[PDB]
Amino acid sequence: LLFYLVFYGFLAALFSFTMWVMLQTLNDEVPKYRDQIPSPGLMVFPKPVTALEYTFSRSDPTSYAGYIEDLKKFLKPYTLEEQKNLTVCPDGALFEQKGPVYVACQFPISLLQAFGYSQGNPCILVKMNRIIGLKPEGVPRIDCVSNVAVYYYGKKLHVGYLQPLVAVQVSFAPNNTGKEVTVECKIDGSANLKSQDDRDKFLGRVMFKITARA
Amino acid sequence: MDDHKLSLDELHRKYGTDLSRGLTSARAAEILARDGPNALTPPPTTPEWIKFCRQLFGGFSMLLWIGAILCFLAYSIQAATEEEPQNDNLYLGVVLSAVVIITGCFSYYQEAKSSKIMESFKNMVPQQALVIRNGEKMSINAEEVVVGDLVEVKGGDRIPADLRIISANGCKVDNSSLTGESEPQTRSPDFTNENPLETRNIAFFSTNCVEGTARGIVVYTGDRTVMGRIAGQTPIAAEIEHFIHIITGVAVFLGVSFFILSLILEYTWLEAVIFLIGIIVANVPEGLLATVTVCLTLTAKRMARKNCLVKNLEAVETLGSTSTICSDKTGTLTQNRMTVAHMWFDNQIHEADTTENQSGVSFDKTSATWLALSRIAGLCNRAVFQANQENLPILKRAVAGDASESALLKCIELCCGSVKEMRERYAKIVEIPFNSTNKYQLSIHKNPNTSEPQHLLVMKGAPERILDRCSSILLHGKEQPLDEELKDAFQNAYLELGGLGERVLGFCHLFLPDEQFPEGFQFDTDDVNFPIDNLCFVGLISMIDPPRAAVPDAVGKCRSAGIKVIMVTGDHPITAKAIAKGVGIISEGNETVEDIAARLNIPVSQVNPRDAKACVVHGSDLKDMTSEQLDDILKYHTEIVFARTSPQQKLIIVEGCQRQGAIVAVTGDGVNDSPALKKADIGVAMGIAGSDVSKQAADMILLDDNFASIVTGVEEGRLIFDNLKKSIAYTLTSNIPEITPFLIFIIANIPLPLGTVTILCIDLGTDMVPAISLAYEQAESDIMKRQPRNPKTDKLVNERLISMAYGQIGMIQALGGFFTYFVILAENGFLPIHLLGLRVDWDDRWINDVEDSYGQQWTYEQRKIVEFTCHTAFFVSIVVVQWADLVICKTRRNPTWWFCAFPYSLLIFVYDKVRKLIIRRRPEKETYY
Amino acid sequence: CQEHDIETTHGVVHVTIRGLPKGNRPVILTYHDIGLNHKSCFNAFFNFEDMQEITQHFAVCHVDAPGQQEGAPSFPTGYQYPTMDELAEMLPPVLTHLSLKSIIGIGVGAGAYILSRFALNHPELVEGLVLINVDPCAKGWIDWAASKLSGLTTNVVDIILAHHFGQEELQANLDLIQTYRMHIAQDINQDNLQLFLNSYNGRRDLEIERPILGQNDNKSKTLKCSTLLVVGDNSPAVEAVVECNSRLNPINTTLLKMADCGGLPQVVQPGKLTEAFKYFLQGMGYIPSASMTRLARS
Amino acid sequence: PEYIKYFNDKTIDEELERDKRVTWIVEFFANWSNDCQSFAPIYADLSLKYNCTGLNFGKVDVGRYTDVSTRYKVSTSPLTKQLPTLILFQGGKEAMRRPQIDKKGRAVSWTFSEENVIREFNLNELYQRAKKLSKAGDN
């Protein structure tokens, strides 16, 4: 009848103990192995309802809202009041760290100027996958082509990290309105930062389809 | 178109053979070379690789071809529609092709292994033929019979080829092969009918000579013969068929439910179809029937090196459910190697001994009664010395014939000597062969004496059946009338000599009067005219037939195993009871009603039969016993001896035993024992001294004619029911590790621990585990101490086996695979607390920022290389863990950071392998763990 | 008991014959196993009460392997010990020195192999054979490797004890194991004992096959004598004797798988072995006046 | 067991005549008897307790050594039920037997349990006497 209750109930005790022993030989700031994620792929924010296809109507507040509150919530820690407690790292450098306490740099939200949905020039943020370590190579630059207008040590150590964002503004002028704009962003000017794969269409390149309903 | 119309001289002309010695070996070899083997009958068979086509097809193996063809069609459509097609559907088709190819190779090997042994069993007992070659009686293999041989067929003998009968001493053949009639048709050397199929001078191939003797010239051997020119459920198999059906139903239910849930969970149509066909063809118990056949064939091979040749695999499992053995004394329970101990010609125990010198104890040819008895014994015997081993001692010699006859011949040679010359002096006129129905054998000879009446009568047989036809005696060479003063002494001699388990044969002779039987009197076997009654008794003969050396131990094993041993014998109720006590059939304690009527003095009619647990039943009392009267004997008595019983009453005995719900094994070595051999659940024939008819009627052949070999076969077949469950509980263990990944997937919303290709790869590596679990088996120390298995109540598969196999040895292999999955996902960053609710974003191809627990962000195609690593690790870990578990179990009882692999799935085994030892659930399930 | 030392062109065999009288009648010749003498193997069997009805009619000759006797000097360092097949060549001169014309053999383990090889070489000097725990086959390759491994890890006494006795009786029967431990370790010379063990391990193969009726009339190769194969139900040598049950003519060969029995059936079940031996001997024309056991008991 | 001492038919008399102060408790057994196998562990755990210097435990196989079965009047026939036999040897001479042999020469049936050995052989008092006397030998 209920004989399995005692058997299964205490069967998990060995399973839990073996899980516990495994969890105490790991760190909390670095994975044991990390070769599957050797280079960082790219991604577009906000994440559409469909396969990276943005679709909003300019004559509607709710149509472009689902992206506006997403961008506002995501870009909240980047604001001026929430970046005043980080050291300003030199521009163009390769800032490293070795101290027992790690602190990230400052990323001002004023970098991503101009979110243009109502104006007719929607702004979507193209991010970069975070990899623990993996210092970038050459001149990292996100090249986005359709007028397209472009503008780590761990979650525990590098606390306060603010990754470099790139904001892509695809203008919808009256002469070209209602089209399905397909932009092709890609990392350029780098060697470690891979950009060519067959099955992995996102390792370096992200392709989104922005469309405004006239 | 035969030679039944030819003359005796014409047979010599046509075939070039002398009809007194046959064609000699010099031409026999040439004729064998020219025409080939006697029994050709070549059947056509499969070209072998055609069977491979059936192995790589059919059953549930065609679902994988359906899946592979669907995958290839979808690949073709995708390649035609979209440029740069995804090389995944082609790989999917290739994998489900190679899986079936490998599984079919496994099945073909596993079936050829069984077929090799099963065909090996058919050559241990070849068909034999007695041909007269070089003027001597030899026994060639039946395939060497040559057109023109001289073949002699006795009773219960398969006829080797088409014979034209030239001599026949009352021969009747069973022609049911070409007709439907089973009545024995008489055969004579005389032309009877124009049709060769209805004449009396032709005996056909494959028929049986059910009575008598004959001799013929082979006319058609291979395919020119009339036979060569013209061309089922058991409880164990039924149980394993019903179980496979219900488990297949469960498999289809689970596969359909999983396919529906996959469609609900946003699966691809082809992916979900392949998942359903990988679940169905992984949960079905394919190979269970092959494993069962492997077990049966292996254990039939094991009990053939112990002289128990089974003629089919259905007798392998019946031998093991046995609860009654009806055995025959002479040959089976006794060695049939007979030596003389005491003599009875006078009213005294006349001892005898070996070591010819000093005459053996103290006695010689002084007594004329002894002289007459010796002459009678020498003349009545048909056994003769083999013409070899002359320098060997008389006792250490080769004699062909009946064992009692051989002992008598050796005795006469040791005492008087030159029994061949003694028989030459007394030329035999007529001979009446011994029959199990007549219980006697007589002969008439010619007397070269002085006061002889010109005719001599010689008789031997059952002592009490001989005294009943004797009116005179011979004491010290003088004839006296028969009275009680000698009858009490004769019965006392039978009681003392027969009470020692010594076989006594009554010999008697009557001087045939000359005035009634002249020199040329008519002497015919049929319608006897000689005075069978009123003979002169010249004494009995007491010799030993010791029990077989391993038979008392076998009776002890039967007694401890709950098997009833019944002795059916034709000997006296005195000798039979003595032998039953000497072999242990009637054990100490239990006494016959005649024993408890003499331990305390009352008449036997005043004794309650319920006080006696042993009885000796005379065969003449069983002939007037109803079915309800034999029932009161077989169930109220634990030890039954049927003495003075003909071979035709063994049918009544086995029928009465079977009316009690027993599984009867019966022993037979004659044509008259065939209905008993065909009625019994197991029919046992004798491989040394047994008819070709009994060897056909039987389901088993005793290569040594030993009762101990039957018990050894029962002991070996008892080990089938505990090895079949180790296979039904090992084909089922792997199912839970195959279906728990998807259940946990659905419930806990975690990345998939195991995929369809790896699901179909798991059941490949774990497919031969039950097969190798039976070649490395062991034997229990109490297999022969248990009561017989009830085949109608004892079930191979029960809830206590299915529940154990699934919920105790599959839920602990599933955890050992889940450990490898969790760890391979943990070393890469994802912690088990994070891996919960992740399957919605883990499986989203357009969410390429899935947050690692250590802060990293993974692309879809980077997550689905760790996922496939987890799948492959799951498969390999489960397979290697099952193999190592097999080795550890049948060894113990009856590297770089790789602690998460096979290590834990063997560690989790250790805990329940040990903790379960504490429960000791009695109604025991700690044999497996 | 008369003890003889016989020079035998391969060493010297020590034989102890009890019941000296002989004639045209066979004697009983016994050969022991590894770790034993004739005393450690057959001295509580021929002293058994039921056995005394068979030893008044037969002479018993007890054969010791060269050097595996009582009070045996150590063999020289690296002495060339005779093979299992040279041990069976020492028996015909034993028979001629004692004026024996024929024997009935009882052998245990290695003695069964030696007596079987002797009966194969000279079938005219043997009438019957009681073979106990007989291994007709070579050790093999996996077993050879395991022996080479256990030779250094385990003591010779424990090796021999595991050879003789099964796993269950190595723990249950306290006084049997504690008796034969002293028997092996204190009554045998330990250099000659390892010599005998080495010669038995590389024992070659008994060339015997079961005669097939008819076709196999070409040459055949088997024992032409009444064989009684004896093994216990719980002995480590069950499979070896069952392999020896095949490759032997079933016409004259008997297999006794004794129940409730272990490694050495002649010392733990001598009553059940005496009865089988008596019936085996009576089947060949000996002691015909001996009453059937379990009949004279009642 | 290194506490029970197994005897031959030479050594038993040697070690019974070696010391006259010592009490010897010797079991006469045979490897074919099934009763001696049942009494085998009981004797072992009795010697595990009462093994003082003045009281040692012995054993002898009378199934193999038939010269002990005669000098100590222990019947090896299986129809006598004399096996196992427990004999006490106070002062080198027999002081008590189990099972006891009556006038006719038939052994009275006796149950060889642990609780029947200490009581009838006075093992609890032999232990105390021997352990009290042994301290005088070292003084």
Ligand SMILES: Nc1ncnc2c1ncn2[C@@H]1O[C@H](COP(=O)(O)OP(=O)(O)CP(=O)(O)O)[C@@H](O)[C@H]1O
């Ligand atoms: N050659 C022979 N001539 C005459 N009588 C014979 C005989 N061989 C056997 N008998 C007698 O025939 C009787 C019955 O023989 P039957 O063949 O029916 O059973 P059986 O004696 O062979 C013992 P079992 O039935 O156990 O094999 C016995 O009394 C026996 O002495």
Ligand code: NA
């Ligand atoms: Na399957």
Ligand code: NA
């Ligand atoms: Na399975």
